[PDB]
Amino acid sequence: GSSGSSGSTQTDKALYNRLVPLVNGVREFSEIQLSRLKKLGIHKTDPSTLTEEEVRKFARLNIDPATITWQ
């Protein structure tokens, strides 16, 4: 990715990347993220099927102290 100017409605999207990075040349959740997604009811494995609605949700549950943003 690339950090710079403040894009549009760029809040969850940005995070999504951090959560599911790309090092193996293939974006795929982890036994950790999943176990958490299930609780919500999102039976998805690939980050592609995920939708803004799901993304924002998967991120919401995860709130970092460094970037504490109170909607």
UniProtKB/Swiss-Prot annotation:
What compartments host this protein? Mitochondrion
Summary of subunit composition and partner proteins: Homodimer.
Q: What does this protein do?
A: May provide the missing metabolic reaction required to link the mitochondria and the cytoplasm in the mammalian model of one-carbon folate metabolism complementing thus the enzymatic activities of MTHFD2.
Domain notes per entry = This monofunctional enzyme consists of two major domains: an N-terminal inactive methylene-THF dehydrogenase and cyclohydrolase domain and an active larger formyl-THF synthetase C-terminal domain.
Q: Which family does it belong to?
A: In the N-terminal section; belongs to the tetrahydrofolate dehydrogenase/cyclohydrolase family. In the C-terminal section; belongs to the formate--tetrahydrofolate ligase family.
Q: Know the name of this protein?
A: Monofunctional C1-tetrahydrofolate synthase, mitochondrial
Species name? Mus musculus
What high-level taxonomic lineage is stated for the organism? Eukaryota, Metazoa, Chordata, Craniata, Vertebrata
Q: Show which stretch of the intact protein is covered.
A: 510 to 573 of 977
